[PDB]
Ligand binder design. Structure first.
Ligand SMILES: [C]O[C]1[C]([O])[C]([C]OP([O])(=O)OP([O])(=O)OP([O])(=O)O[C][C]2O[C](N3=[C]N([C])C4=C3N=C([N])[N]C4=O)[C]([O])[C]2[O])O[C]1N1[C]=NC2=C1N=[C]N=C2[N]
Ligand SMILES: C[S@@+](CC[C@H](N)C(=O)[O-])C[C@H]1O[C@@H](n2cnc3c(N)ncnc32)[C@H](O)[C@@H]1O
Ligand SMILES: O=C(O)CN(CCN(CC(=O)O)CC(=O)O)CC(=O)O
Ligand SMILES: [Zn+2]
Ligand SMILES: [Zn+2]
Lengths: 116, 300
C-alpha cells in the first residue's frame, strides 16, 4: 500500500488556485538587526525580514498532520523563522516552498551567497 | 509620563487602603490601541509584560523551568508562548497548557483542564493567562472566584521553588482572594496593567521571589477593592510606544544559584537571598509532567 496524503502539494495547488494563504502566523517584535538566517532559536530578522514563531509557520503543525520525517521531528517548532518581508503574507507557503542552505544557514535564494 | 513605559504598576498608596468593592468603570473602556503592523494583541501584551518583568529581581538559574497556563487561543496558536520563549534564555524549559488544543513552540504542551495537570518537579516561574468566558455572565455581586484560581493557589504553594516568581492574569470579575493573600508570601508584589490594554480591567498579579511563608497578611477581598479603586481613579492612556524598543528585551541569564534545602535550613540569611533574586531552592532533577485523563466507555 503506497497511500499517503500529500499536504505540501495540496497547499501549493490551493495557493496556485488563488486560495487565501494560511493566516494567524505569529509575528514577533524584534530589532530587525539580526543575522538574517532562516531558522534560529530567537528572532533574527534583518531589515528585509519578519521573524515568526516557528510552530505557527509550519504546515504540518498547523494542519494537525504528521511530519514528513521518519522520527516526526519538526524543523520550525520551538524556533523562530525569518521570512522575507515580501513573502510575509504567506509564511507557511514560504517555508514549504523554500530551502535553507546547509552551509551558511540563509534561505537558498533569499540570503544565501555561497555561489560567488 | 507613563506612556513610554511597557505598562503601569499599582502604586503603593493604593495597596495600603481599606476600600470597599465598587463596580469598575474606566473612561477609555472599549478603545483599542494602534498596534504596530501585523502584530497580534497578545504578542504586544506579553511583550510589555516581559519588558516589565525585566525591571524586577527574578531568579534566572541555568536550566530555568517555566510553566504557562491558559496558553491557547481561539486562533489555534500560542502567541504568548512565542514571546516567553523569545524572552527567556535559550534552552529554558518551557511547558504550556490550555483546555483546548493549539499548536505551540513550548518544549511540551498539555491539553485539558488545568486541574488535571501534575508535575514531579518545581518551577522558577509560573505564567497564567487563563480566563473563563462565563465570567462575562455577571449575574450578582462580584465575589471571589474559584475554579482555576483554586488550582493555581495550590500549585504555587506546592510547586513554586523558593525564590520563584509568578504572573497571573486577573480582571475586574476574574479574581480570587486567596491569590491576593498569597502575594503576601512573596518578597514583593504588584498588579501590572499593560499599556496596550490600558482600556481593560485586566492586570497581571505579579509575585516576586517566593518565600513559602507570609511576609505580610493580606485581606484579598480588600486588596481587589483597592485595585479597582486604583483603576477607577487613574485612567491610563493606551500606548504602544515601548513595543518599538526591543534592544534590551531578553532576560539577562543571571545564572542564579540552585540549592536543595530542608525546611530547617531556611534561615534569615537564606531568606534574604531569596528576597533579592539571588537564590532558588528546589530539587534540580529532571522535569516530568502529566495530565490526568478521565476514561469513559460511551457504548451502552
Ligand atoms: C485575550 O484575553 C481576554 C481579555 O484581554 C481579558 C479581559 O479583557 P476584557 O474583555 O476587556 O474584560 P473586562 O471587561 O475589563 O473585565 P471583566 O471581568 O470581563 O468584566 C465583566 C463585565 O463587566 C462589564 N465591565 C467591566 N468593566 C471593567 C467595565 C465594564 N462595563 C463598562 N461600561 N465599563 C467598564 O470599565 C462588562 O459588561 C464586562 O463584560 O481576558 C481575555 N478574555 C476576555 N473574554 C474572553 C477572554 N478570553 C477568552 N474568552 C473570552 N470570552
Ligand atoms: C485570553 S485566552 C489565552 C490566550 C493566550 N495566552 C495567547 O497567548 O493568545 C484564556 C484561556 O484561558 C483558558 N482557560 C480558561 N479556563 C481554563 C481552565 N480551567 N483550564 C485550562 N485553561 C483554561 C481558555 O481555554 C482560554 O484559551
Ligand atoms: O483538583 C485539583 O487538582 C485542583 N483544584 C484545587 C485543589 N488544589 C488544592 C487547593 O485547594 O488549593 C490542589 C492543587 O492545586 O494541587 C482545582 C479545582 O477544584 O477546580
Ligand atoms: Zn511542524
Ligand atoms: Zn549558503
Amino acid at each position: 500500500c503506497a497511500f499517503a496524503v500529500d499536504a505540501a502539494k495540496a497547499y501549493k495547488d490551493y495557493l496556485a488556485s488563488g486560495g487565501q494563504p494560511i493566516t494567524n502566523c505569529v509575528k514577533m517584535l524584534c530589532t530587525h538587526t539580526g543575522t538574517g538566517q532562516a531558522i534560529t532559536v530567537t528572532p533574527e530578522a534583518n531589515m528585509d525580514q519578519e521573524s515568526f514563531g516557528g510552530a505557527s509557520c509550519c504546515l504540518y503543525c498547523r494542519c494537525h498532520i504528521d511530519h514528513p520525517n521518519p522520527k516526526g521531528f519538526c524543523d520550525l517548532k520551538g524556533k523562530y523563522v525569518q521570512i522575507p518581508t515580501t513573502c510575509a503574507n504567506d509564511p507557511v507557503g514560504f517555508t514549504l516552498k523554500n530551502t535553507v542552505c546547509t552551509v551558511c544557514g540563509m534561505w537558498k535564494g533569499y540570503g544565501c551567497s555561497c555561489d560567488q | 509620563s507613563q506612556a513610554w513605559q511597557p505598562g503601569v504598576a499599582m502604586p503603593n498608596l493604593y495597596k495600603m487602603q481599606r476600600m470597599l468593592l465598587e463596580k469598575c468603570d474606566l473612561q477609555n473602556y472599549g478603545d483599542s490601541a494602534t498596534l504596530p503592523k501585523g502584530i497580534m494583541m497578545n504578542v504586544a501584551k506579553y511583550t510589555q509584560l516581559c519588558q516589565y518583568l525585566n525591571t524586577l529581581t527574578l531568579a534566572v538559574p541555568y536550566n530555568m523551568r517555566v510553566i504557562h497556563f491558559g496558553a491557547g487561543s481561539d486562533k489555534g496558536v500560542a502567541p504568548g508562548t512565542a514571546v516567553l520563549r523569545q524572552w527567556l534564555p535559550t534552552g529554558t524549559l518551557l511547558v504550556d497548557s490550555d483546555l483546548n488544543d493549539f499548536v505551540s513552540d513550548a518544549d511540551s504542551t498539555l491539553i485539558g483542564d488545568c486541574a488535571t495537570v501534575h508535575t514531579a518537579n518545581k518551577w522558577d516561574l509560573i505564567i497564567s493567562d487563563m480566563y473563563d468566558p462565563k465570567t462575562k455572565n455577571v449575574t450578582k455581586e462580584n465575589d471571589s472566584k474559584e475554579g482555576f484560581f483554586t488550582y493555581i493557589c495550590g500549585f504555587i504553594q506546592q510547586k513554586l521553588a523558593l525564590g520563584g516568581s509568578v504572573a497571573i492574569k486577573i480582571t475586574e470579575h476574574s479574581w480570587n482572594a486567596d491569590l491576593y493573600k498569597l502575594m503576601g508570601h512573596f518578597a514583593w508584589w504588584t498588579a501590572f496593567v499593560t499599556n496596550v490594554n490600558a482600556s481593560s480591567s485586566e492586570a497581571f498579579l505579579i509575585g516576586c521571589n517566593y518565600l513559602g511563608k507570609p511576609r505580610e497578611q493580606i485581606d484579598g477581598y480588600v486588596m481587589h477593592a483597592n485595585y479597582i479603586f486604583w483603576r477607577n481613579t487613574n485612567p491610563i492612556q493606551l500606548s504602544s510606544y515601548s513595543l518599538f524598543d526591543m534592544s534590551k528585551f531578553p532576560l539577562k541569564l543571571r545564572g542564579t544559584a540552585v540549592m536543595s534545602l530542608k525546611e530547617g535550613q531556611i534561615n534569615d540569611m537564606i531568606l534574604s537571598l531569596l528576597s533579592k533574586g539571588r537564590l532558588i531552592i528546589r530539587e534540580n532533577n529532571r522535569v516530568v509532567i502529566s495530565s490526568d485523563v478521565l476514561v469513559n466507555n460511551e457504548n451502552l
